[PDB]
A paper describes a structure:
The BET family proteins (BRD2, BRD3, BRD4, and BRDT) contain two tandem bromodomains and an extra-terminal domain at the C-terminal.
Here, we discuss a newly identified small molecule inhibitor (NSC127133; hereafter, L10), a phenanthridinone derivative, of the second bromodomain (BD2) of BRD2. The phenanthridinone moiety, which sits in the deep cleft, is stabilized by both hydrophobic as well as by several direct and water mediated hydrogen bond interactions. Moreover, the O9 atom of L10 is also hydrogen bonded to a conserved water molecule W3 (2.92 Å), which forms a three-way hydrogen bond to the backbone amino and carbonyl group of C425 and N424, respectively, and to the sidechain hydroxyl group of Y386. The carbamoyl moiety, which links the phenanthridinone and phenyl-benzoic acid group, makes direct electrostatic interactions with NE2 of H433. The phenyl-benzoic acid moiety protrudes away from the binding site and does not have any interactions with the BD2 protein. As speculated, the ligand L10 binds significantly well with BRD2-BD2 and the dissociation constant (KD) estimated by globally fitting the equilibrium state response observed at different L10 concentrations is 213.7 μM. Superposition of the BD2-L10 and BD2-H4K5ac complex structures reveals that the binding of phenanthridinone ring moiety of L10 mimics the Kac binding with the BD2.
Numbering used by the authors: 341 to 455
């Protein structure tokens, strides 16, 4: 059920999203900007391993379209995106290092959400 704080909290989420997409973080955020194009990358097993792809452009579309009803729903998608990276890639891959850095940005600011 919607709470009177959900709009406020979703603004905090949108602020985080905007930060994740900003130039500040581009050196490590860029792999997460758009859906993984598995064929283009030669990742022909990606969609056998990753059942629920997620990326920041999809999170942005969902936010713009008011698809997210609360902050928890938003956070679950951002975390899904990172988990897909941790699932698919060896843990020493540079994309995993990038994901961990971007997730640290996310988690520290998400934990400042007004309530
Ligand atoms: O070549 C390597 O990079 C390599 C290095 C170490 C071990 C294996 C390989 C490899 C070997 C053969 C073919 C391809 C790869 C490879 O892993 N590529 C690749 C490229 C882009 C992304 C990705 C994986 N995985 C993501 O999760 C992802 C998420 C967002 C955007 C892009 C990517
Ligand atoms: Cl994905
Ligand atoms: Cl979660």
């Amino acid at each position: 059920g919607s709470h009177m704080q959900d709009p406020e909290q979703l603004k905090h989420c949108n602020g985080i999203l905007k930060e994740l997409l900003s130039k500040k973080h581009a050196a490590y955020a860029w792999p997460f900007y758009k859906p993984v194009d598995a064929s283009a990358l030669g990742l022909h097993d990606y969609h056998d391993i990753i059942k629920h792809p997620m990326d920041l452009s999809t999170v942005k579309r969902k936010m713009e379209n008011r698809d997210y009803r609360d902050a928890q729903e938003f956070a679950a998608d951002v975390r899904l995106m990172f988990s897909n990276c941790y699932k698919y890639n060896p843990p020493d891959h540079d994309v995993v290092a990038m994901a961990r850095k971007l997730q640290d940005v996310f988690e520290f600011r998400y934990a400042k959400m007004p309530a």
